[PDB]
């Protein structure tokens, strides 16, 4: 609605100066048809050369001073509309990033892509271009009608009777032609979706010898267009006929009335030239304003999707305010039970209770599924638990500050995504301040990535493209490990650290886990399927069915001959 | 260069079968130009008549010739656009079909290397940009060039002294238009680069949000997107400042030449060498001769982009496919002996990286064969080489004591079928997808294929039976049902050598095995690809695959 479109209020001093310069430019532009009727009346009755000189210098100044004020008026408006479009586009990106995490799973990424990138840039650029054109020609359409009344009312009134009678057939056929033009463009783009569907699955088409069948399916879509295209081409010829004939018939209607009036001595022949020159300029200001208005109406129709996206409220609780200086690192679970809110009918996790302490390693093991990685999601404040209480150093997680908590809790994902940036900054991602050069080298030392990254031709400044093309799965693990080691997290989460690690960095992983001097201020949660690290863990728990089944230390559990005995003998 | 000359003649050979439409369209072009140019000549002749008597023999002749040429200009211009819009549509549909047919025969290494974003732009947007050459860019250029000569032909007839002053300011109007059109295209290219740069920032943040929230860098990604917009905003303002500066130059210059000719033309008319009628005919032409030079320079700039956008398509269409010569051997005796003899394959996109290292084995028609190996060993590449999808670098593949590339393309793929590792379902109906690639079949075989592959049980849950429409990409049905549809797609064809590639697909491999022992009949070769050894047994023989070497 226009009321919700009441932005750009802070710039109302700049926009008012624009509105005072468009009217001053519109008044000084119409001097040209005024001083052609005074010259055509000067020649018809002679006169001094002073009046020739005086009429030329007033047309000299007013036409020059009308082009300058348009140029000052144009840039002003273009300067301010650049700021409003850019400030709002950056404002809609802050809203989506503050939405809940569950917005970003079921709904497609490309749907979020369209609403931010070109459903706002092309919406604003179409509206800012089509609003000034509506604003420029409305004042010229209003300032021309003012002097038409002052000139002669008799020929002015006969324009307004014949105007809507002559501007119904051009827009009735004009409506019919643009209907057929958009039916071609829909069927042309529909056939492109069929052709690109078969091209993206070429191994499937080739293995069934269906190259002839896909050529026939495309030829059926194109043969449908040609049937409706002959009728569309005729409708372009009729539309060009009606616009041309109705425009020309208007010109001869006003000339006959004026010629009868000017031969009766009522008005001079000078005033007829001014009026006819105003007739074409007033008509053009109407037909331009008639074509701009549907485009502006279309743009504000699509503006309700952007503002609904900005006005929706997140479901996640807001960030806390507490930033304590030092953290001990204790975290405990109090009978928690998490369910995915996308399908809350299924309890993924239930009845979980364990405590972690600095200096001890707790390993979570189990089969595929059964909510293995879901426990890591709840720890780093990605979802809220449906049941139970979660405590970090005696305090709940959402009570803590958002940026400080993630700086003290670091995790390694199942498939660690990498972004296309400099690897010096990619290692030091997300820090409040840029660290010095020593810490990145020390992080590469403690991660085992230094043996490979130093062999690059650029080294720490080696650029990486999208989706991690110039790296191996093992090198993707090593680059992620150093990312979680700079900030020195009080609680460290290790999920699938050795999925593709069978080298010296795996030895550095267990060296950091079990014999590094800094383990006494860190708590580690470990989820890998390698049993070599499990047997040295201080605490080992079994996860199956989203609940705790067996527990205790390592040596306490084979003597029970429980589930740990199963895959060891296998 | 001569490269543009061949693109001139190749684009003209494309529009040869539209000869009767171009002749009728180019007739109406010439008829309309002569109609409009004579209108201002009769305008001044009426005024010169309007200084004497109202004699019918000259006044009524000039009025009648006014309305005849006004009718002649408007009626012909309507039929010119009617015959040119139909011509562009016929060219657009001709080059879309011809390109898509030529893109369909390329080797499989072409589609792996080429992104799908580029092929969509060539098909959808570049074909439109090349069909605008003859009906639009050569139409406007020819219409404006004839009209400009016609206007200066009459100006020389009116006053040879006055028309020389029009030629003096001309070289500025050509130079100013050529400079602005060069600068405007340079900015609009830089807009396209910086727009996709800002969309690259939101590319990483939205898709990989889980890594973003894991490190608390939401305010960091907002900061980088706010900075990437400031680079776009500087270029948006630069385009609008240059555009609004060019209009101010054009408006001052237009007034400048109007005063030079109103002053000097009046001084000539007071000396008796010009009449009031010939002055009015001179002034109407002069306002029109400036607006046609600007159109002529602008269009000729755009004609070079139409050829440049037509050189990407003509390079995709003329690229030679890397395929073996087609075979015509289709014996009816196809008992199905498959022999591998020291095969070695390297991917064409990534050469000198061997996958196979001299594999050799033999398949017997009446038995069951199983392949087992680790992930990434190359089991699916053996499936691809068995269907003539590639050429092995070394060795050969022998089918019935013949090389596999020596058979007919339609006959071989109707006898050696497979089920893909990741099934793909198209946008047709269910009945159209089971009988995919089949020229003619009855409804009984489709039902029977669903019965054998356990696809008829869930086919009656949703209405219309087997005529139900499937959504695009197959995103309407369950993942487990998609493998059952893919399996039934193989069996309806009545194949001879059967390949099943479930691999990571489970929880249905025992539903197929329990009914039929991997659908082994006794004269149909069956190859089953699995990851675990404890799963087959059924197979008469087993060949483990490790790093491209059998054990």
């Amino acid at each position: 609605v226009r009321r919700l479109l009441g932005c750009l209020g802070s710039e109302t001093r700049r926009l008012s100066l624009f509105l005072v310069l468009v009217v001053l430019s519109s008044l000084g532009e119409m001097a040209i048809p005024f001083f052609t009727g005074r010259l055509t009346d000067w020649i018809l009755q002679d006169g001094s050369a002073d009046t020739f000189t005086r009429n030329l210098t007033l047309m000299s100044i007013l036409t020059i001073a009308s082009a300058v004020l348009e140029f000052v008026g144009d840039g002003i408006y273009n300067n301010t509309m650049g700021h409003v479009h850019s400030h709002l586009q950056g404002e809609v990106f802050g809203a989506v990033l503050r939405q809940e995490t569950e917005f970003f799973q079921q709904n497609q990424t490309g749907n979020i892509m369209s609403r931010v990138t070109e459903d706002t840039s092309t919406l604003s650029d179409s509206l800012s271009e089509n609003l000034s054109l509506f604003l420029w020609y409305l004042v010229r359409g209003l300032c021309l009608l003012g002097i038409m009344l002052w000139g002669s009312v008799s020929l002015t009134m006969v324009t307004l009777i014949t105007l809507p009678l002559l501007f119904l057939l051009p827009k009735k056929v004009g409506k019919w032609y643009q209907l057929l033009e958009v039916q071609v463009r829909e069927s042309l783009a529909k056939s492109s979706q069929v052709a690109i569907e078969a091209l993206s699955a070429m191994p499937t088409v080739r293995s069934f010898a269906n190259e002839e069948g896909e050529a026939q399916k495309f030829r059926e879509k194109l043969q449908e267009i040609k049937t409706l295209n002959q009728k569309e081409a005729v409708a372009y010829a009729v539309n060009s006929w009606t616009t041309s004939i109705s425009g020309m018939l208007l010109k001869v209607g006003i000339l006959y009335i004026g010629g009868q009036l000017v031969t009766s001595g009522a008005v001079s022949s000078g005033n007829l030239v001014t009026f006819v020159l105003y007739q074409m300029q007033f008509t053009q200001a109407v037909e331009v304003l008639l074509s701009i208005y549907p485009r502006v109406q279309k743009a504000v129709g699509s503006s309700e999707k952007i503002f609904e996206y900005l006005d929706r409220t997140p479901r996640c609780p807001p960030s806390g305010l507490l930033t304590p200086l030092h953290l001990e690192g204790l975290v405990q679970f109090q009978d928690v039970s998490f369910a995915y809110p996308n399908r809350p009918d299924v309890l993924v996790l239930q009845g979980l209770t364990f405590t972690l302490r600095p200096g001890e390693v707790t390993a979570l093991v189990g089969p595929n599924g059964s909510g293995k990685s879901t426990v890591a999601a709840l720890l780093q404040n990605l979802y809220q638990p449906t049941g139970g209480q979660l405590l970090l150093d005696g305090k709940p997680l959402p009570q803590y500050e958002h940026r400080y908590l993630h700086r003290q809790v670091a995790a390694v994902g199942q498939e660690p995504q990498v972004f296309g940036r400099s690897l010096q900054e990619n290692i030091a991602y997300g820090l409040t301040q840029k660290p010095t050069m020593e810490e990145i080298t020390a992080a590469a030392v403690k991660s085992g990535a230094h043996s490979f990254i130093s062999g690059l031709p650029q080294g720490y400044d080696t650029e990486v493209d999208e989706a991690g093309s110039q790296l191996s799965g093992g090198q993707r693990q090593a680059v992620a490990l150093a990312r979680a080691l700079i900030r020195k997290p009080c609680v460290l989460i290790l999920d699938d650290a050795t999925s593709a690690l069978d080298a010296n960095s795996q030895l550095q992983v267990e060296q950091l886990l079990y014999e590094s001097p800094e383990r006494y201020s860190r708590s580690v949660l470990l989820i890998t399927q390698h049993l070599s690290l499990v047997e040295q863990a201080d605490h080992i728990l079994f996860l199956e069915g989203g609940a705790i089944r067996e527990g205790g230390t390592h040596q306490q559990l084979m003597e029970k001959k429980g589930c740990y005995w199963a895959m060891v003998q296998a | 260069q001569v490269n543009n000359k061949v693109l001139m003649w190749r684009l003209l050979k494309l529009s040869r079968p539209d000869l009767p439409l171009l002749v009728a369209a180019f007739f109406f072009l010439v008829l309309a130009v002569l109609g409009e140019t004579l209108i201002p000549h009769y305008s001044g002749r009426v005024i010169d008549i309007l200084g004497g008597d109202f004699d019918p023999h000259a006044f009524a002749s000039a009025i009648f010739f006014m309305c005849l040429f006004s009718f002649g200009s408007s009626l012909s211009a309507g039929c010119r656009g009617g015959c040119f819009t139909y011509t562009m549509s016929r060219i657009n549909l001709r080059i879309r079909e011809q390109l898509f047919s030529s893109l369909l025969r390329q080797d499989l290494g072409f589609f792996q290397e080429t992104k799908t974003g580029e092929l969509n732009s060539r098909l959808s947007s570049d074909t439109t940009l090349m069909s605008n050459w003859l009906p639009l860019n050569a139409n406007v250029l020819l219409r404006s060039l004839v009209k400009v000569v016609g206007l200066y032909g009459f100006m020389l007839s009116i006053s040879p002294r006055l028309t020389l002053l029009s030629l003096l300011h001309m070289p500025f109007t050509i130079a100013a238009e050529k400079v602005y059109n060069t600068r405007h295209q340079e900015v609009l290219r830089e807009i396209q680069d910086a727009v996709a740069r800002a969309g690259q920032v939101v590319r990483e943040a939205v898709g990989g949000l889980q890594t973003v929230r894991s490190f608390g860098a939401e305010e960091h990604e907002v900061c980088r997107y706010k900075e990437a917009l400031e680079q776009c905003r500087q270029l948006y303002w630069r385009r609008d400042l240059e555009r609004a500066l060019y209009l101010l130059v054009r408006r001052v210059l237009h007034l400048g030449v109007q005063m030079l000719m109103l002053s000097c033309g009046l001084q000539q008319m007071q000396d008796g060498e010009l009449t009031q009628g010939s002055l009015l005919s001179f002034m109407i032409y002069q306002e029109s001769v400036g607006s046609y030079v600007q159109t002529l320079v602008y269009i000729y700039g755009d004609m070079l982009s139409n050829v440049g956008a037509a050189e990407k398509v003509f390079s995709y269409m003329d690229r030679q496919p890397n395929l073996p010569s087609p075979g015509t051997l289709a014996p009816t005796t196809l008992q199905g002996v498959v022999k591998f003899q020291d095969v070695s394959f390297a991917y064409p996109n990534r050469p000198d990286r061997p996958v196979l290292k001299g594999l050799t084995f033999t398949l017997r028609p009446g038995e069951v064969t199983a392949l087992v190996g680790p992930n990434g060993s190359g089991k699916s590449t053996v499936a691809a080489l068995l269907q003539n999808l590639y050429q092995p670098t070394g060795g050969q593949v022998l089918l019935d004591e013949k090389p596999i590339s020596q058979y007919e393309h339609c006959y071989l793929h109707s006898q050696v079928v497979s089920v893909g590792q990741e099934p793909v379902l198209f946008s047709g109906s269910v009945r159209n997808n089971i009988a995919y690639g089949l020229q003619s079949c009855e409804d009984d075989k489709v039902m029977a294929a669903a019965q054998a592959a356990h696809a008829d049980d869930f086919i009656q849950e949703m209405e219309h039976g087997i005529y139900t429409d499937v959504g695009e990409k197959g995103s309407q049905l369950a993942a487990g049902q998609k493998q059952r549809l893919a399996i039934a797609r193989a069996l309806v064809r009545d194949p001879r050598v059967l390949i099943l590639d479930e691999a990571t697909s489970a929880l249905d491999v025992q539903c197929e095995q329990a009914l039929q022992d991997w659908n082994s009949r006794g004269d149909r070769t069956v190859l089953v690809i699995a990851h675990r050894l404890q799963t087959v047994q059924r197979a008469h023989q087993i060949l483990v695959l490790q790093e491209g070497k059998l054990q």
Partner: peptide, 9 residues
């Protein structure tokens, strides 16, 4: 600003 009519075909 000034409207520029798309070119006639």
């Amino acid at each position: 600003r000034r409207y520029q009519k798309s070119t006639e075909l």
